[PDB]
Symmetry: D2
Subunit: 506 residues, 4 copies
């Protein structure tokens, strides 16, 4: 009677659902859901990459609090999360896919498998289908049982070359559409959900696609013509990007078209190459949509659609060639701006939210809706007021994101160039109505983007005419960090009668 369906699409841009790229991709099921629900237009990931972003989404805390700042950085074992809190509400959190959680070494034996991968499922989640990108054993066994020939898992991602053996960038995937990673995970959800109907269930479905190595099964590989797509938003050359801030030198080098596909090691970043990858990515998104329609159809068929809290989002964005860069290890909005659709029984269908919302607001929304206590450790705030077309009077007027550009055992390109250590790798972003401020822990100058001017296309931090804006935004950023320190026990008080707690948000 009270179900929770939490879908995370890895790496889908907000502008593909609504915005600059929306008219160049077919997303009917996601657009039909938005039409029958609440869409959040100013929704941003609080951190990057995949690991820190998921840690934040699943714990409801900023990276400065949860401290799983990089892929492989452990998360404290006693950190309250959506699964642990939903278990207190009597739910068995069902997992279809991955959580990308780096386990606490203090909670396991040194030789335990859980400490050998940063793709490991988070404490509290009950895994029904394991579908981690680097280990998709059920999907790999499915392809082997289907009669697909592959001596290595990496061979599965190589696009089919031409008849003459010539490698083809947008060549169809070695697997048919019905045997794809997207189709298979959806099939596993539909093979396991029927018996859960009637009881209160919590299902967490995580789609990797669209995501590198970029390959799509027939007909999605060529469904979109690269020649009819818009070119990425970028300055004329890679050196013009690096000229805006020295940070962009390592950023445009971190990822490339050559690292986003398998079988093309010497791949040149030409307009033909860039547009092909862009078309493959969009085809993978239409494939995800198609399979999401089947998930929705199942809820309607079982009469469970109206009695379910549906949460659809993307973990982080993707540059997609924008600003001569790929991936999400950068400071531009496209790496953080993510779609968010929430359907709840009695919500305002077709309602569009313009207020800044954060990835950390998801966990408290779910707990609020089920009627479970939100821990004080949670930095995020429930989006429930927005569901009935309203809003809280004391809402955020800016959004905040973090990044870490250090790696403890293998120094990053930024560390090799600028010479900072792994305690000074933190980057912070503050998105104000007019400005975007970027501040580094390391000895790198701030970035300032004026949306009333050139926007993200010009770093104006060195301009003395913007000194008062720079000082005001940086104090606003300083205050945010001071107002959002670890609240696990900071609102508890030791009194003569015992320990007494104060609720963080009223």
């Amino acid at each position: 009677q009270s179900n929770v369906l939490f879908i995370i699409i890895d790496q889908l841009r907000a502008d593909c659902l609504w915005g600059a790229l929306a008219d160049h991709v077919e997303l009917p099921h996601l657009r039909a859901l938005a039409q029958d629900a609440v869409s959040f237009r100013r929704h941003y990931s609080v951190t990057n990459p995949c690991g820190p972003s998921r840690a934040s989404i699943l714990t409801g805390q900023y990276a400065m609090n949860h401290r799983s700042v990089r892929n492989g950085t452990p998360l404290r074992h006693d950190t309250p999360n959506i699964a642990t809190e939903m278990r207190k509400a009597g739910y068995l959190p069902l997992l279809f896919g991955y959580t990308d959680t780096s386990q606490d070494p203090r909670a396991y034996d040194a030789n335990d498998p859980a400490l050998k991968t940063y793709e490991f499922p988070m404490r509290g989640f009950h895994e029904v289908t394991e579908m981690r990108l680097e280990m998709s054993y059920p999907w790999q066994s499915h392809l082997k049982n289907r009669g697909y020939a592959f001596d290595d898992y990496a061979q599965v991602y190589v696009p089919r070359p031409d008849a003459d053996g010539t490698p083809r960038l947008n060549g169809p995937a070695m697997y048919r559409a019905e045997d794809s990673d997207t189709a298979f995970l959806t099939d596993q959800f539909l093979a396991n959900m029927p018996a859960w109907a009637g009881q209160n269930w919590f299902a967490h479905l995580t789609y990797i696609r669209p995501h590198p190595p970029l390959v799509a099964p027939a007909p999605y590989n060529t469904m979109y013509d690269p020649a009819k797509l818009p070119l990425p938003a970028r300055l004329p050359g890679r050196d013009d990007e690096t000229a805006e801030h020295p940070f962009f030198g390592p950023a445009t080098r971190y990822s490339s078209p050559a690292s986003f596909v398998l079988g093309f090691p010497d791949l040149e970043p030409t307009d033909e190459t860039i547009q092909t990858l862009r078309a493959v990515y969009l085809g993978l998104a239409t494939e995800v949509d198609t399979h999401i329609g089947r998930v929705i159809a199942h809820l309607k068929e079982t009469g469970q659609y109206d009695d379910t809290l549906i949460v659809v989002t993307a973990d982080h964005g993707e540059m997609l060639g924008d600003r001569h860069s790929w991936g999400k290890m950068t400071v531009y909005d496209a790496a953080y701006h993510t779609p968010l659709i929430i359907r709840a029984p009695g919500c305002k269908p077709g309602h569009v939210v313009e207020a800044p919302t954060e990835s950390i607001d998801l966990m408290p929304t779910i707990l609020d809706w089920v009627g479970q206590e939100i821990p004080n450790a949670v930095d995020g705030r429930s989006l429930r007021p927005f569901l009935t077309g309203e809003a809280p009077s004391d809402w955020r007027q800016y959004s905040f994101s973090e990044l870490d550009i250090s790696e403890p055992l293998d120094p990053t390109l930024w560390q090799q160039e600028f010479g900072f250590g792994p305690s000074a790798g933190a980057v912070a972003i503050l998105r104000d109505a007019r400005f975007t401020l970027v501040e580094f822990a390391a000895d790198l100058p701030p970035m300032l983007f004026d949306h009333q001017g050139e926007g993200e296309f010009r770093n104006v931090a060195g301009d003395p005419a913007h000194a008062a804006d720079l000082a005001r935004l940086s104090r606003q950023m300083l205050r945010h960090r001071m107002r959002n320190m670890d609240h696990t026990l900071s609102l508890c008080s030791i009194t003569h009668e015992g320990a007494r707690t104060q609720r963080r948000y009223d």
Copy 2:
């Protein structure tokens, strides 16, 4: 072979040992130790009051990390501390006094005595003598057994009135000097240490005095003439103090001479009153000094002096009427500037350190000296290079302190006047060679004190001529927060072979 003697005097100002007040107080044993050891002249508490400031000293972390931000705010049970780490080195940490540790409610039964007091001993410490200000059962029993008449513990702190019954502000204490709180604790140390000689011991001895309720046993009560003491450093009136920044309104109103003594509820803050309290305070510091000489004499007599790491400091300072304020719930240096003497076998005797040192540097110094691994959670750095007259090239160039002006269950005077909640109570101080910057989490403007100008006697943050200094120092403060986030697991990495760690400090 390797002993550790860690003495902490509560509320002793740095300027009493060396500085403005040094010539008005006799501290021969502390000054003799400084002459035979290393003195740290720019040593500051990283937080306040007692509880937070004790949590920082004993954990080696900033309050932003340990999160025991106010008296009664719980400290995480799994937080590494000097006692837990010394236990790994094979030491039994002996406690003579108090730690003022607010226990983790998650680690105890709801009705446990440990959760009813914020004066409770820290995990790992083995208590030999209990001597917490609000308790002191061994000392209270010593007083009853010696035949002192008192129906309430609060009666013990009331100064002896005149023969005619007239209350006397600097009246001698009810107890004789040999029966005092200072004498009794020293006697308990000397009644228990003889059998520890020969074995490697770690003793932690904590003197409350000098500390309110201000009362000194004969002859200390009147040893210093209030009429011959210098007046406090202050602006002419209370309104001049508060005109500098609104924070000082509630800050000068938080403590008073009337709250620093027992039996004078209507006590007027006259110059006669202020100077009397100041003379009583200095008399208690001299009595602490005489008893510390007995502790040193014991080490020399047993031939344990040369083979012992001696650490002598104060937890925090005391305004003592300076700037029309009392206590340590403020932002001025007198509340944080603390004496620090370190004697180690082979140190440079009489060496004076001018580099900025922090209270969090004590725990890593002890661990380094015993040869025990310093946890990555520790924000402080070992002072060991300074002991042989050297100094690390990458050492601190500024000091950092924090305060919390909010109370979750009982709103403070600042909360009542300024309207902020318990998530916005944080204050931060950055002490640069020239400037001191104060920044609030709440919507209160910064403070800026120029030490080449009027010093602390003028807040220059609103002066346009200091706008560039203000912006530069605030970025330096922002970077400090970003460079010192929780390091418990942030330097650990999940690899294909298991979890691997990176050492924080060089």
Copy 3:
């Protein structure tokens, strides 16, 4: 290169593989494995029912040590088990089916799903396929997706009635053979194991069948003619069984043919009924065998058969009408005597073991073979010496089993009749070469079965001619309990240099 395949068949009698019933059932794959491996002929479960038996098999301890004495009795969270110990060896224990583990309430939130079922998976096991008898959600969803009509899970177990609607006892199951519980679990193993090939895997496959509610899909339902089967071994009537020991009154009443099937509430225990249930049970065993052949074929096809430790056993026996009783809540051998086949690279193929072996010997055998330390808590001993046709000189000369006939919240039929409480429900069995002794914690007399006389068909404990045998066996039983008390820390010693441990078995 070093794999572990651990198969548990729930409720299969030892005499079906080799013995009295072997010639009346086809088990070719299990018999082919025995021909190419080591068979253990005197193998007994140390406890009953399913829960305590599994607890013992998975922990390697007697019920007197693990204390999970009934279905629903919690097992201590820190109890070392095969999964926790295999995780230390670097294995991810893969679960296909169930463990029937009652979780520790001290380790979970009061409202957690893990505390609402005693079928919950054991700590350390990674569940790939959930197949718990009372909740087979993947199998129930498979039947629903296949187009099977059922409004209740209990309807799935009702045998197909005749054309005219007349209920038929050995009617075929509502599901076809390819859609059965046995077939489905085997399919899930084969859908997930291919990608594990090459790496060291540990797979735990648990078959419920043969087990009530007795129903078999076509053609297994009628494959064996009830008219050509031998009748159960029993005294002439139910009252003759109860006359041997008053214990047998509640035992023959606990289970019945009517409780072993669904859709026959008034089912009479006629010879026609008893033989039909017996034929259905044997058909379910041939179905299990058939699917085990597919598991073996997969290992051979992948070239993983010779490099795998294969362990095949049954958890507990089944009375199957023997002694006018059904199930395993009794003291006769048929309830405990279980098949055991172990194949290891380099073992003696076709070797038959006659020495008494216990269910607790499985966990130490696996750990020994992988080269992982066996905890001292483990009461069982490695069967590795028997694999090369040898045996240890200090082996057991008797086997030991336990049962609990109390229920804390709902008093059993034994408690209602004899009037004992839930601290006196323990029963103990000692199987000597000649005698079997049964001793009760409650005020019920012992049982003594002389195999050189009438065997289990006559309780001779009241015969004064057997007083010396009774006294000798009871002292042997007393000594066994005293020699097998909780060894978790009893072999550890606190010394002046620290804690030192002594290995339980050399």
Copy 4:
């Protein structure tokens, strides 16, 4: 309002307070308390020695359950004890002395001081004064400060030799009576208890004396003439003792007069020697008595006597030359029979209890009286009904004791002579109204003592006339083990609504 005073005298025989030795020793304060309270005449320790016997008293469990079976054998960290349970009731358990608790290696760092001694204080106890026999640092420091000359702690226990330097067996102790171990501990209790008056306190005071090395300060050393004392109860020679059962060979050889004193390595067990040790022991018991009178006087003086639950007992007994043996590593009653006096407001003064009581009954009595839930793990039963002169109808009809004659790292004299390992060291004793039965885990025959015949002076287990009594008592012993298995979670049940518990005791 509700105080708990728990005094434990180490090694005081029951027959010294009332019985065979009572007329040869002055115990006025203990006898005055018995006259104003309830005395338990059939009170026995459930295990031995000190460590196991202290673990049973403080946990309320049999050694078969708590498993700290020898000195140095760790006790599980999560074992509920009197201190942990009293902390739930809001009490701070104050310790004056020792608990002799072997800590759990799983709960501490490998190098922790707590894992280097089996005299370490039990979890939950708040140590006020440390006074363990192998340590006693406060008492050793009291001795150095008072000016006693000793270069080694062992020199303190050497009796003062004659003027000519001739060693004297009953020579006065080096220290004066006012400086003794007994006097000093009492002084520490009285120096710390005054400030606890008014509040609800729980004080645990543990006197080592009477206990080896046997030495008494003047005038106690010679207060009793060894020539006027009765000789021990024994068979004529050592070989007569050992002829009764081979166990007594190593048991009479384990301790001797030479091992019960310091400075006499070649001490002959003559009647003069034996009687001298006996007179010294009785003199130390009289000195314990004088100091207990001061503890009682304090309660009366403060008006806290009538409002306090007073529990006075001994941990175990002492052979004292009886049966040619010393100490408590034996099976005779003198090693277990201990005095027990309980005073509670409203009890029947002068009431004498004859029912069998056990050391495990103390913890549940205290918890019951304070109104705190008794855990199911507790094997003991509250003695509260007996306090008002009543007796439960389902009370004990026999008492049960255990011993362990094995040592994991250093094989005992029994292991060396009989050849059994450290899993077979358990001994069990059952005291019936007429018989005493002794059963070994190792292959040693039982002992049977008829109290209507020769008592303990003849082992009658081999007599055919006692074969039926032997079999009956051994079944009663078997049933006791089966009725008292670990109850930590065995009465908890996993249900569809969660975990539900059943109360152990009626």
